[PDB]
Design a protein around this ligand. Structure first.
Ligand SMILES: CCCCCCCCCCCCCCCCCC(=O)OC[C@H](COP(=O)([O-])OCC(O)COP(=O)([O-])OC[C@@H](COC(=O)CCCCCCCCCCCCCCCCC)OC(=O)CCCCCCCCCCCCCCCCC)OC(=O)CCCCCCCCCCCCCCCCC
Ligand SMILES: CCCCCCCCCCCCCCCCCC(=O)OC[C@H](COP(=O)(O)OCCN)OC(=O)CCCCCCCCCCCCCCCCC
Ligand SMILES: CCCCCCCCCCCCCCCCCC(=O)OC[C@H](COP(=O)(O)OCCN)OC(=O)CCCCCCCCCCCCCCCCC
Ligand code: SF4
Ligand code: SF4
Ligand code: SF4
Lengths: 176, 269, 53, 318, 94, 152, 112, 172
């Protein structure tokens, strides 16, 4: 359909034009709002007082990585070379080679933490359900020699909290 | 400072006062995109459509995911689309909260920014609860929506919407008829011509200028046809009648979000 | 969106405004001051990285 | 000990101009819905001792391209005519008694803008060059709006001194009778001293940063402490020239007490604006003075001249 | 009228909170000085108060005390210290 | 003797408690900087007042993506800043370039161009791991200007 | 005799405070490279300042309205007289001689 | 703060001039004036005339000069070197400065030398006042406001200014 805005004409009669000459010359407008709508300061401030208080999130949040393990640990990753092949940024790097018993596992697993674009494509391709984006924004170290991760940085970083992780998926896994 | 969340360097030869010349240099953000999307598959290369602009998120990808379902001869199931109207028409509340304000931070005011972004936050939750992340969120796909939304949000959309038409009434008494602003914008940068078409402009700086056309009701998207709305229009081609679309275009949306909470049929995604 | 009949695409050519709404600054503003040209831009809603078009 | 009455003035004021900068963002904080500098204080009241010390540690570069002889005598001012102007200003007892002294402000109100023209020129090219030129041009056209509407009332009080101007406002708060003028006494000092709604001189929007752009932490405390030594003075003036208190030959002290609970309300006006209104685009900025502000100010002068004469009113002075 | 009304909460926010000792000490850590209602058990030295459910987002808060693990004493507080359980509580994820 | 090391509980507490950060808007990451100065998480008034001119700053901040044509601009701006300067990158594109890291027209990494100090990792860092990236930099002044004059 | 004691007191705090700010770290041992990198964000800028007129007149235009409001200044002393009609009839002339001098030029300010 | 605080101003004034009375690169010309004008308005504030002194600040030194300084950006000189620039200004200076000095030296360095410079005595300000008096606004230029007797003096100045603008509305 339509509408027309800013289409109006002044009335042009001496009952009006005072009302527009009691405005220009006496400032009866322009004190209407910012004489007032500004104050209106008397509302409670809204601030999350940071070092202590913190704000909301959701169980589907994304962040620092992990590699779980079952009960008594198997290093849940089977090195099926997938979370590697859907990765848009191509951070992941994986090198398998048959472990002594003959069950296969990894050797090098490196997520670069600069390239990773935080998809949620590597949480959703792993069929054996290993690699999982943690909900901890712990980060920010002082040397780029660092953020590159090896395998045996990840596991700890994913065994430091599994009380966080293992209780999110069981909220979220019923939807997908 | 006047970069508008971006980077440009423009050069003008002004005549002593009047500009009469300008010739900007864009190309500071190029990044090399369309050479890099021949090298990625279809579902792997989606986000580089979300990261294109910073403000509208689910409205991009609504324009990719509709350019793929075609070549596939496939439509989403009914509960797909009626999401893509609720988020699709909730981010028109973002770029219209920004382009009335972070435009008018150049005009120098303070509060119409620090007054609003209290609120543009209460929306960013609703990207985080539905899927994951703060802004860029990859949700729409070639197949309709990714995964269903939690038990909730329909008491956090409704409760939030019925509060909102008031805040948009604190950007009105603070702007429209405030003189020092009316005088900063009227009859300024008027293109009324049929060059304003000849250049092939898109929506607003059209619809606010007279010539009357919109791609929401002349073409269907994804069931967009079944809800009623009116397309505000402007009088004279200056700026302050391209502003006045972007208020009366934030007071149309709350009609649709209010009209689209009643209809969502159960079904797959 | 061209597509060659197999998995990876071929040209995917995006156009967003910013090749129009800023094609028309030089035209639009000739004859007003400099302290307008700051407040002309804001109405087109030019936001960049999009002009990666 | 007359020298210890002076130095008791210059020092105790540099604390206000310091601790204004804090109440700058608390009051302007709650307009935004938030709290003001908080973490460091505990209340914040301890912020400005940490800020005064970051600058003078922080290295004071000079442009290789500057003329150093001017790059000193200019700021070696922005702190004189700000601290001299305070001298003859009754509260209630001014340090000096100047016969005609009211006129002496305009002497020192007129001689500061000749410290802008130096600095912005002293340094270098077009952000402070033609950018410090055209803030000269607006600063001198808001005097003619001034000296007249200062000269108006002085027909309504009899003389040029300030000891009479407490006597005449006795039980009549001199803002009734000329309330049309009083408005223009306000928009002037806000337009002349480069504050919020006509902001252009110091840049944010129209340019990068006006006139401050070159000075690093070293000199730039002075200006940032000079520009706030004018603003709390004209506003510590207006309220001796309009909203009068009632002298008390007995408890002088209750004069100032009730006097800072006015001049300190009044000031909190240039902060209560700055949250609110936008800028003028330098055409509209002067273009609204000749056409609009001025014709009245003459017209009223033809009025306050006759009103005493036409009522047998003529105020008791020479 | 409003001089003694609200004032009766603050004088009980002071004189009934640690007296003078347990007040200036919780203010110098931050200006968070409001005393929540309940308490919490966990864990080492770090409490969790939790407010009465009269706020949203500033209703759930925390307290750091001293030298967690090979740590500087107090005025160093970062916020990666919370035990990896409360991420399921303090962040309002659940 | 001991006066020096007690003096640096002043000067090394002054420079850490007032910062005048420049910012660079370039790319997506700029918006999740704004919301640090919006009232929710309120950047200013926690000691750090927001943007000033290039000359008056201390800590510049790099958001966004740095193409070729922007490098000649940055390295110049980083200079003019006064002494006590730092560089805190943020976002997954100042760390080695997000993606675009294989492109032709993106510099790879923005450590290459300047001596960067603190990092933060992800498309937009969540407006949180920003401030917890600064409460690293206000804790990254434990340094002493003693023991250069006063040892060697 | 105490005015000049209240002036040279004021400058000498100010003319002191330049050196204790500008000069003191100016001889500090930091790097301070001589590179021609200074004069921010208009890197080179080689031109004369061209004559731009509507900058100029707003000088002249004032200077003349200025004079007579020195002539106009001694009204409030002159309100005490013998024959006063020669005042009101005369006083009101200057003003209208000022206001006329507007109305003419007011046909052309240009962009002021 | 002796009786010579007048004689010490003028001989700074007389030296206020010779700065810009030679050839100083006239962005320092101003700084040869606002000192001279300042000390000039200094001398006048003795003798009892006050109002008439404090005006030179308002109408001339404050108001006029700024126009003299608001240009010399329009006529703007070249950035050759300025001031000490060309090696020539310095030569002309001293011989002026000494010429009063060598005057001021033996003008009276002794009892008298000789006649034409000997009829000016010094040091008590012999003339500088007379007796006592009453008060009118002060006595002297306290009454400088005549819209009484002076009229044909104003109405020319009143009318001669009104034409000041018409001439300058044109050639501009
Ligand atoms: C010191 C800061 C610490 C502190 O105050 O304790 C926090 C403590 C905690 O209270 P709270 O949790 O912040 O509650 C806030 C309320 O929700 C919200 O508080 P509020 O909005 O009620 O503000 C209280 C009050 C604040 O104003 C006052 O200062 C009260 C006057 C005290 C006089 C003694 O503001 C007024 O209402 C002024 C009314 C004055 C009467 C006007 C009626 C005359 C009409 C004529 C017709 O509050 C107080 O102590 C209030 C007293 C303020 C003392 C300030 C210093 C003394 C002066
Ligand atoms: C018989 C006795 C005599 C009887 C006389 C009867 C009454 C006459 C007295 C009236 C005189 C009042 C003051 C003079 C009028 C106000 C000044 C004025 O004329 O403003 C005109 C201004 C021009 O605007 P306009 O013509 O519309 O052009 C723009 C179009 N886009 O239009 C405007 O609105 C400009 C508004 C002001 C611009 C700056 C405002 C910035 C905010 C500052 C407000 C704070 C001041 C409040 C006062 C505080 C006092 C303590
Ligand atoms: C950069 C570093 C180098 C510079 C360092 C020195 C800088 C000095 C700058 C001077 C600036 C202030 C000069 C303004 C002069 C104002 C004098 C004045 O107006 O005093 C008013 C008063 C009037 O007398 P009245 O009140 O009518 O009668 C009293 C009867 N008992 O008058 C009196 O009471 C009598 C006057 C007594 C004072 C003696 C004269 C003093 C003025 C000399 C100023 C010399 C000019 C210096 C350079 C000025 C440049 C701006
Ligand atoms: S997690 Fe899934 S994807 Fe990553 S390696 Fe183990 S199996 Fe292959
Ligand atoms: S996180 Fe995002 S980017 Fe890093 S690997 Fe998994 S998908 Fe690829
Ligand atoms: S990564 Fe950070 S910078 Fe690169 S695009 Fe995503 S947001 Fe903008």
């Amino acid at each position: 359909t339509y509408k027309y805005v800013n289409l109006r004409e002044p009335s042009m009669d001496m009952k009006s034009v005072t009302d527009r000459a009691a405005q220009t010359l006496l400032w009866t407008e322009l004190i209407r709002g910012l004489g007032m709508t500004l104050s209106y300061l008397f509302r409670e401030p809204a601030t999350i007082n940071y070092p202590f208080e913190k704000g909301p999130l959701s169980p589907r949040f994304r962040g620092e990585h992990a590699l779980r393990r079952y009960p008594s640990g198997e290093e849940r990753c089977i090195a099926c070379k997938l979370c590697e092949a859907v990765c848009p940024a191509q951070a992941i790097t994986i090198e398998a080679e048959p472990r002594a018993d003959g069950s296969r596992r990894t050797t090098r697993y490196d997520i670069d933490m600069t390239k990773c674009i935080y998809c949620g494509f590597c949480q959703e391709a792993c069929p054996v359900d290993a690699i999982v984006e943690g909900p901890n924004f712990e980060f920010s170290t002082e040397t780029h020699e660092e953020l590159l991760y090896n395998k045996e940085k990840l596991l700890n970083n994913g065994d430091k909290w599994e009380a966080e992780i293992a209780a999110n998926i069981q909220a979220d896994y019923l939807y997908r | 400072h006047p970069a508008a969340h971006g980077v440009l360097r423009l050069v003008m030869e002004l005549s002593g006062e009047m500009v009469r010349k300008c010739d900007p240099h864009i190309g500071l953000l190029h990044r090399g995109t369309e050479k890099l999307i021949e090298y990625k598959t279809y579902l792997q290369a989606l986000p580089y459509f979300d990261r294109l602009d910073y403000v509208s998120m689910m409205c991009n990808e609504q324009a990719y995911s509709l350019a793929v379902e075609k070549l596939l001869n496939i439509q989403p199931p009914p509960r797909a689309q009626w999401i893509r109207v609720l988020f699709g028409e909730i981010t028109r509340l973002l770029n219209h909260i920004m382009a009335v304000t972070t435009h008018a931070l150049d005009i120098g005011a303070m509060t119409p920014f620090f007054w609003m972004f209290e609120e543009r936050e209460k929306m960013f939750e609703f990207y985080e609860r539905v899927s994951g992340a703060r802004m860029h969120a990859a949700y729409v796909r070639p197949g309709g929506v990714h995964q269903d939304l939690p038990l909730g949000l329909m008491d956090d959309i409704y409760e939030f919407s019925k509060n909102f038409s008031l805040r948009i009434d604190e950007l009105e008494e603070m702007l429209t008829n405030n003189r020092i602003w009316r005088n900063r914008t009227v009859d300024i940068g008027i293109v009324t011509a049929e060059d304003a078409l000849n250049y092939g402009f898109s929506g607003v700086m059209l619809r606010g200028s007279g010539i009357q056309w919109d791609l929401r009701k002349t073409q269907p998207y994804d069931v967009y046809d079944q809800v009623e709305f009116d397309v505000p229009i402007g009088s004279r081609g200056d700026c302050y009648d391209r502003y006045l679309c972007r208020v009366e275009e934030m007071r149309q949306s709350i009609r649709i979000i209010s009209q689209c909470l009643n209809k969502m049929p159960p079904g797959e995604i | 969106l061209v597509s060659d009949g197999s998995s990876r695409p071929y040209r995917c050519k995006i156009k967003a405004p910013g090749f129009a709404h800023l094609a028309g600054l030089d035209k639009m503003s000739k004859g007003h001051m400099l302290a307008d040209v700051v407040a002309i831009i804001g109405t087109q809603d030019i936001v960049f990285g999009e002009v990666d078009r | 000990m007359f020298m210890i009455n002076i130095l008791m003035l210059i020092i105790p004021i540099l604390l206000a101009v310091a601790f204004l900068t804090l109440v700058e963002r608390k009051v302007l904080g709650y307009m935004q819905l938030r709290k003001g500098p908080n973490v460091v204080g505990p209340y914040g009241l301890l912020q400005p001792i940490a800020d005064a010390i970051k600058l003078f540690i922080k290295e004071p570069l000079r442009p290789a391209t500057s003329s150093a002889s001017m790059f000193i005598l200019a700021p070696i001012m922005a702190l004189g005519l700000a601290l001299t102007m305070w001298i003859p200003l009754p509260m209630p007892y001014p340090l000096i008694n100047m016969n005609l002294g009211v006129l002496f402000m305009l002497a020192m109100s007129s001689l500061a803008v000749y410290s802008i023209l130096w600095s912005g020129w002293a340094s270098n090219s077009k952000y402070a060059l033609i950018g410090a030129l055209r803030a000269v041009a607006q600063t001198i056209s808001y005097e003619v709006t001034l000296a007249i509407i200062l000269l108006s009332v002085l027909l309504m009080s009899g003389s040029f001194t300030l000891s009479t101007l407490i006597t005449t406002q006795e039980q009549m708060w001199l803002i009734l009778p000329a309330w049309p003028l009083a408005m223009m006494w306000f928009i002037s000092t806000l337009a002349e001293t480069n504050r919020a709604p006509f902001d252009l001189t110091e840049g944010e929007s129209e340019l990068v940063s006006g006139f401050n752009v070159e000075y690093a932490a070293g000199p730039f405390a002075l200006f940032f402490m000079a520009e706030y030594a004018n603003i709390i003075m004209m506003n510590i003036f207006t309220a001796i020239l309009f909203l009068g208190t009632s002298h008390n030959p007995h408890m002088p002290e209750l004069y100032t007490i009730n006097f800072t609970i006015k001049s300190l309300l009044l000031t909190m006006s240039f902060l209560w604006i700055r949250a609110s209104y936008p800028r003028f685009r330098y055409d509209q900025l002067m273009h609204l003075l000749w056409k609009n502000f001025l014709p009245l100010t003459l017209a009223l002068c033809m009025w306050h001249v006759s009103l005493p004469i036409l009522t047998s009113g003529i105020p008791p002075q020479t | 009228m409003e001089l003694l009304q609200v004032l009766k909460r603050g004088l009980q926010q002071v004189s009934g909170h640690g007296g003078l000792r347990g007040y200036l000490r919780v203010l110098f850590r931050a200006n968070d000085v409001r005393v929540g209602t309940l308490v919490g058990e966990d864990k080492y030295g770090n409490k969790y108060y939790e407010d009465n459910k009269q706020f949203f987002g500033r209703h759930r808060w925390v307290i750091y005390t001293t030298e967690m693990n090979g740590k500087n004493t107090f005025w160093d507080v970062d916020g990666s210290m919370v035990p990896p359980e409360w991420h399921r509580w303090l962040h309002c994820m659940t | 003797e001991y006066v020096v090391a007690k003096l640096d509980d002043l000067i090394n507490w002054a420079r850490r408690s007032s910062l005048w950060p420049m910012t660079f808007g370039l790319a997506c990451c700029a918006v999740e900087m704004m919301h640090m100065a919006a009232p929710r998480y309120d950047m200013d008034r926690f000691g750090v007042v927001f943007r000033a001119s290039p000359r008056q700053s201390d800590v510049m901040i790099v958001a966004g993506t740095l193409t070729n044509k922007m490098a000649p601009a940055l390295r110049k701006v980083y200079d003019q800043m006064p002494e006590p300067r730092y560089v805190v990158s943020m976002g997954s594109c100042a760390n080695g370039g997000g993606y675009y890291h294989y492109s032709y027209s993106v510099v790879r990494g923005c450590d290459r161009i300047v001596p960067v100090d603190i990092y933060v990792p992800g498309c937009p860092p969540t407006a949180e791991a920003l401030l917890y990236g600064i409460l690293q930099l206000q804790k990254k002044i434990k340094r002493e200007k003693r023991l250069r004059i006063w040892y060697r | 005799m105490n005015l000049m004691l209240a002036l040279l007191t004021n400058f000498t705090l100010a003319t002191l405070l330049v050196i204790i700010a500008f000069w003191l770290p100016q001889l500090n041992v930091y790097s301070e490279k001589t590179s021609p990198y200074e004069c921010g964000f208009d890197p080179m800028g080689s031109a004369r300042l061209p004559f731009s007129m509507k900058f100029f007149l707003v000088a002249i235009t004032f200077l003349l309205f200025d004079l007579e409001i020195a002539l106009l200044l001694p009204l409030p002393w002159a309100s005490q007289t013998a024959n006063l009609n020669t005042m009101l009839t005369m006083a009101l002339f200057l003003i209208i001689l000022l206001a006329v001098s507007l109305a003419y030029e007011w046909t052309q300010k240009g962009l002021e | 703060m002796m009786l010579y605080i007048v004689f010490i101003l003028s001989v700074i004034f007389v030296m206020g001039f010779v700065g810009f009375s030679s050839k100083p690169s006239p962005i320092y010309g101003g700084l040869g004036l606002i000192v001279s004008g300042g000390v000039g308005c200094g001398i006048v504030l003795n003798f009892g005339g006050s109002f008439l002194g404090l005006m030179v600040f308002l109408i001339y030194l404050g108001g006029m000069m700024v126009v003299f300084g608001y240009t010399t950006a329009m006529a703007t000189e070249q950035y050759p070197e300025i001031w000490l620039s060309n090696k020539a200004v310095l030569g002309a200076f001293v011989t002026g400065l000494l010429m009063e000095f060598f005057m001021v030296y033996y003008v009276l360095k002794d009892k008298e030398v000789e006649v034409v410079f000997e009829f000016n005595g010094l040091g008590d300000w012999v003339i500088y006042d007379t007796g006592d008096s009453g008060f009118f606004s002060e006595e002297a230029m306290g009454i400088a406001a005549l819209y009484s007797y002076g009229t044909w003096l104003v109405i020319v100045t009143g009318w001669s200014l009104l034409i000041g603008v018409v001439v300058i509305m044109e050639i501009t």
